[PDB]
């Protein structure tokens, strides 16, 4: 049944237990931004990483 309106869905839904995994690729280990941070030494371009 729809969780919002309560009307039952016209199609019938395939559902059941399935063994899922959680991978190590979060988003909080990947998000990063920059606005004029640190600078490399030899050429004065920004850092990497």
């Amino acid at each position: 049944y729809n969780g919002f309106t309560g009307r039952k869905i016209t199609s019938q839904i395939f559902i059941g237990p399935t063994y899922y995994q959680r991978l190590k690729h979060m988003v909080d280990d990947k998000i990063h931004s920059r606005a004029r941070g640190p600078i490399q030494i030899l050429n004065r371009q920004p850092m990497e990483g």
Binding site: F4, T5, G6, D28
Partner: protein
């Protein structure tokens, strides 16, 4: 850390309004009601109660974004009649429905207990 806190779904910030009214310029006798910190729980019963009124020509609601907590209800009524009084009549009928339902429920609960 970008997680919004759990209370933000139902708590008005300072300076926010629970309700805002804006006239719809495209067609006459139509108005948009914006409700802050409410969801389908309130909008669906408001829409269904508005659709029992024959003097209501249009009634609908939407959530603009699920991560946002807002709901918009568009009401259009016949001339001689206002969408605002349509809305408050729908509320004061829906409260009457819930009060009657509560009374009959507690009576049936007492009657189930050895009766």
């Amino acid at each position: 850390m970008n997680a919004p806190p759990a209370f933000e779904s139902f708590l008005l910030f300072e300076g926010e309004k629970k309700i805002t009214i804006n006239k719809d310029t495209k067609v006459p006798n139509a108005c948009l009601f914006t409700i802050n910190k409410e969801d389908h729980t309130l909008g669906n019963i408001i829409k269904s109660q508005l659709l029992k009124d024959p003097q209501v020509l249009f009634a609908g609601y939407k959530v603009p974004h699920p991560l946002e907590h807002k709901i918009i209800i568009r009401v259009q009524t016949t001339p001689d009649y206002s969408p605002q009084e349509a809305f408050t009549n729908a509320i004061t009928d829906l409260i009457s429905e819930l009060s009657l339902l509560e009374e009959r429920f507690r009576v049936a609960i007492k009657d189930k207990q050895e009766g």
